[PDB]
Amino acid sequence: SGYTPEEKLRLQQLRELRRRWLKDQELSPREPVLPPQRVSPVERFWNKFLQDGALWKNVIYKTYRHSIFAFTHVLIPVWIIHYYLKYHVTTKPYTIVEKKPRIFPGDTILETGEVIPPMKEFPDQHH
Amino acid sequence: SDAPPLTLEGIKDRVLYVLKLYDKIDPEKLSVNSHFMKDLGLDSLDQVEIIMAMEDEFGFEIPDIDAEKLMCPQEIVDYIADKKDVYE
Amino acid sequence: KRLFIIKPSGFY
Amino acid sequence: SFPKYEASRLSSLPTTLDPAEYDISSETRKAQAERLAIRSRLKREYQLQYYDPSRRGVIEDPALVRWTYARSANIYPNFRPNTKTSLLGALFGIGPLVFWYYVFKTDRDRKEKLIQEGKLDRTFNISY
Amino acid sequence: NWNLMCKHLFGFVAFMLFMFWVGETYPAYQPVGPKQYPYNNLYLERGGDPNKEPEPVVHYEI
Amino acid sequence: MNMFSSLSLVTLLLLTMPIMMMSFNTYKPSNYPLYVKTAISYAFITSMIPTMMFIH
Amino acid sequence: SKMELPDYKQWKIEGTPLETVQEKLAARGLRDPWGRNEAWRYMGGFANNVSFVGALLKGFKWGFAAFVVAIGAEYYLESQK
Amino acid sequence: MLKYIIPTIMLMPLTWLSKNNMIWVNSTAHSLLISFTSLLLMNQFGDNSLNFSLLFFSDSLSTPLLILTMWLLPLMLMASQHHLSKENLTRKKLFITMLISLQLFLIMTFTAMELILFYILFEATLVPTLIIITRWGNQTERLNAGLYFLFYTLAGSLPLLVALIYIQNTVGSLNFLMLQYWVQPVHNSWSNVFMWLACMMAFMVKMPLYGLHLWLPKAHVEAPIAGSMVLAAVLLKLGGYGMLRITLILNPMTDFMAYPFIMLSLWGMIMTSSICLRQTDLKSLIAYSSVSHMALVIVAILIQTPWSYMGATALMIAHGLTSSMLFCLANSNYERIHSRTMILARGLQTLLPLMATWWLLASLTNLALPPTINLIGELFVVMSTFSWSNITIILMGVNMVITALYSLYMLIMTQRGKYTYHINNISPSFTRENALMSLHILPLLLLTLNPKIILGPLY
Amino acid sequence: GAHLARRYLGDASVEPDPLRMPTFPPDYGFPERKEREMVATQQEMNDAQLVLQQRDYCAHYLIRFLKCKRDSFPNFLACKHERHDWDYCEHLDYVKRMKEFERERRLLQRKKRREQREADMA
Amino acid sequence: TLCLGAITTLFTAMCALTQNDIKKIIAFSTSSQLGLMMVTIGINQPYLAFLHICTHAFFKAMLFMCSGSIIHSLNDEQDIRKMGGLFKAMPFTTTALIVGSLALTGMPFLTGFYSKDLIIEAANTSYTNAWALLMTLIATSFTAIYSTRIIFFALLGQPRFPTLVNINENNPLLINSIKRLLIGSLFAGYIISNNIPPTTIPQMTMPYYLKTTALIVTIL
Amino acid sequence: AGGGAHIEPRYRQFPQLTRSQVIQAEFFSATMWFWILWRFWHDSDAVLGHFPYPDPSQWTDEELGIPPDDE
Amino acid sequence: YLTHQQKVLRLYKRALRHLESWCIHRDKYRYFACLLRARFDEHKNEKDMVKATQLLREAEEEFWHGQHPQPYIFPESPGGTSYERYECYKVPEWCLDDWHPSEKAMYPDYFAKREQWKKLRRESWEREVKQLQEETPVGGPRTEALPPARKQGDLPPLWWHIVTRPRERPM
Ligand SMILES: C[C@H](CCC(=O)O)[C@H]1CC[C@H]2[C@@H]3[C@H](O)C[C@@H]4C[C@H](O)CC[C@]4(C)[C@H]3C[C@H](O)[C@]12C
């Protein structure tokens, strides 16, 4: 109900080998040996700028990155979609259809200036 | 996964820390090589509970084919360090 | 502790 | 008290509730040890190629090859045209064909009949 | 036991199916009359032929 | 209407931008999870404008 | 690192539900050796955990305390008109 | 059609007169130009076909098949470069000549205007196809597969020869344009029942019809990769293209003679789809998949409604690229483990990250994931068969479920799980293999943007 | 409800049948009755594009509520009074449908009451 | 459609009463909610079924995130039998977990109240199958059972998780992500309810014992 | 997993907690109860009853057009 | 197979594990667990094996009647939720031999040290083969156990794969 004398021997010999393998899996400080990279000028002005965690500096960077995104992901596409919709899509028949806006008594028609008769007098509710 | 990695000392300290809380072993004589059966007079039925108190500590099951083979609190430490990939 | 990750060759 | 367990092809008998497990005799003891010999012998042949540092390739397994060959290539030469095979081949091969024939043919006969009578609604059917 | 599972599973399914038919033939509702709609029971609103004058239907106040 | 249409489709197009920019690798990795989150964030607020036009 | 485990002599089953279990087992001629191993779950910040009725009422004092203040402003403001 | 026939022939001098080490570069490069020029065949009209001369004509049905035909020969040269590396230089050139000759007969089969000229070229593809299987297969069973392949085809083709000559005697012409205006109804009699069978049986063996398909799991499984691609991609479409043309002169008898064959095809879908669930061999799973996809095409052709014809044309093109792509993917694994067993190599996604993406795209197209052109082709057939009989939706729907199984089962078994421990020669994917898959999927997914060019003459 | 017990446990002839009501003539009582008033006309409800299930006799109140809700935007908490007026007018309608049900309840009890004496006596 | 949903909303709600894995309990909770959505379509209330989709998105998502937060803390231990004593240890996940459960069960004026209670109101006062009506009401009782099962087996009591565990939930991504849904699972239904245009004739008059069926059913 | 404050683990002890963690959780619980109590005060008929439910029995036979038995 | 001494212990372990699932609360578990130990102690030293066997056989049928239908399972054990979760990140070691020369240049220290291991395996193989040829029976191995290293300097036979096995959490 336990290791035989030879069983423990193999385990000890295998076990000590295993740790050395795991030990060898460590990476030296030099590794990884990254090759050269052509770094952008813009990041340089930020890595030096964001060397310190100045609270006021973070906001400028926070607003800077958001503004870039809001321009290249929201403003440019809507120009394209609006240009696509206005001069290629809406110019075709029955391409864009809008549910006719609801009209209520007393309303004023912007197009023709018509006046809708109000509803008949409600006798009384009180409650 | 954000947890602190295990250590050989950490395994040993916790393993003995569980044994120190068992009423059928004297903490005075409890060493790493104190065979559970011959050197402590514990029946196998106790050894089963000893292992069950460990796998509930490290939270990982140990197969019966191997658990019964562990008869020394150093073997438990070696077994876990070998099955958890610890080397230093 | 910055161990080495064994992964297949991704260069190709 | 403890209702007996009743095994099924989709539910094997638990090993703990198997009477043959406890009834151990000399022949049973040797058999298991004799089986382990074969089980152990094959492990040695596999590991002397698996662990070889000069090997690069697939360790061919006769057991796997024999399985594929038995499933496809060896089927026919061991087939005999008897009642067991012939009856099964008839209601599995021709059975479904004749059934579906008298389902689709009947459906279209009734459908064609109504279309001529003019009492089949096809008001907005101009794609076919 | 495999046999026991079939009995309970089919027993549950069949029992539920039976009750839905039982509840179908004996529906529950509220003690109310039909909901009443304006002139001609909305003959024109819901796709009525204008030429075919409908059978007049009139709802009287209680 | 011209505003209702344009802001409705930009919502769908916006979500597809990270997929297109991951096809030609015109971005910097290790910020992609945060890149996707921002697109969803901006997609949400744009979709509100058509929703308000519907509510109104 | 070398984490510091707490003293192993501070785990006593005294005055904890493990104590009551032992008393029942003593009358039956049995003992519960693992009582101290399970003791830490009844000592420290794990002592006297809230009951279900209490949990659903979490934040009631400040929620109600804020409510009374909020309504007080309403009536006082409404008194003006 | 000489602007494509002569260039194809010139590929034969090109291969033989090239340097020893540049036979693949020149044939692969120059055969892609021939493929490029094939796009000029798209000059179709809404009422008339392209009638070049007294022999050759091209319409909206033959045009997509020609473009697919001339597009594969470059891909069949790419696939063959591996297993032919250690081979005699002269033999490495006869193999290329067989591929070039095979394409030569195909581009004239789909354009032949006269049915007897169609028959000869349709029948002449057996020789180069038969030679490829037997000479350059890797197994002992290639010899028996060429016999099954040869005699299944001839046993049905020879009766077709008697029928066409009989038609010419009693009509005066087999020119396809003439038959459109001189076609006469086929009265129901015992004489015609054996002319309808004679005309259709030749093509239904090559589709293949269920029951007569025993040759296909032998030919496709045993042939080399180059043979498998053409056999599954373009050669099966000779049968379907034949029925789409011969059915013109078999009305109104085709309405009741189709019952034995529609029933065989409708039920054969489930039979062959189900076989793929219990297949040990990866290449055989793909071969049986082809029979189940061609079962729909047989059904669509025999019910003769424009939706079925539009869908049928799209299945032929859609299956052509999908089936060939699967064979290349399955072959890539074979070139490493050198075994066709499906379970032998597993967990290959952890070892070949990119090759496992093509498996995903190949499988998703096989199971007709919308809006791919497999779904478009398969949808129109289901829509038209419903109008034929509502009950068919049960069989069409049932086959869809099983198709979703043997496709993703193939993906899971080989690309997921634990890798086989004892297999360690899984070298990365060569640039040749990755480009070979990109040349299948990308054309197949681009056609979703402009599907009308593969919807046949009934569009 | 209790009536379901009466209609399913007990008599059926003295319990209204919802799929059949009304049965007795509208003028059995009420020697003269008034036709329900309809404030909103066909054109009003069509221009406002009310759902066909909303075009009941309470449409005029609903039409006003829609008008106030749109104007109050973005103040979605306004037009509270218009909603209560609309809901209340529906409560009155539901009352009528309940009384209509009862009229069938009591009238049915009459037939069973005046047909036993016409049966036993002769 | 009414009958198909009714059996599911009850059968799946029944399965959750005994599940141990924390995710599977919420998974079955989802099935019961989906069934209730189909019953609403069955009783011809298409918009209320949609209104339950919108509201159900908020708090149902939160419970998974709250559950996922617990699972990571206890090192990928998903069994409620091996949790406990977390009411004080993880106050933010606790508050989020509590708020979600009350939304699910139909606590008044939360996100789930403005859609689930309107559904129960429309079921009773309608020409509906009696058995299907009963299953919806019974299933609502089971909603408060497995919900309490998660609270009782995951927050109260005494710890059952291993000795060395790093119960940390201070990562700002976790708080902010949940803190956005916690707001939603409170006032999401309130805002959408008062803003969507009317499309029906809501049944706002009925017996008292029907108007307060869910409350008594849930509280019981 | 990554980022935010750092809490050293403890052994068989109540885990270390921060100040912000407990304040935020407590505040949201208070908001939940304020919302319920506030809404309940202003909105009670939504959970109790909007309008009285008539009792059919008490309705007189005259208002429902129920004439006498004899006639 | 298993010896009757083993079969009892395994049944004892399962009874506790299923008991823990039923009891849930640790205090309650400690109660019924103690009662169970008593039931297993009253027959600790039974003499007749036939009666001892009948006790095991009857004990099993009681366990099957009361076993938890959904017993607690540890996350990474067969049947656990996290079982085999990370198998997709456990790439083998031979995959490094295919790395492009540029890739190996990024970890010069690792691969240079890896080469030491490869030579260590290559040189000691021919000895390990003999070590098993001599120590095996004439017919062939009768059991799966391997001998340890006897002569100083020799590594245990069949060591490379069990020593270089992928880490349990490679990534
Ligand atoms: C704006 C957003 C988050 C900024 C923040 O909240 O602090 C940041 C996070 C990751 C960034 C993106 C990623 O870096 C990928 C792209 C890289 C280039 O900056 C172009 C846009 C690009 C898509 C970036 C836009 C913007 O700078 C992003 C989207």
Ligand SMILES: *C(=O)CCCCCCCCCCCCC
């Ligand atoms: C009645 O309107 C249908 C109610 C169906 C659900 C059961 C609600 C409980 C009703 C009890 C009957 C009490 C009669 C006074």
Ligand SMILES: [Zn+2]
């Ligand atoms: Zn090869």
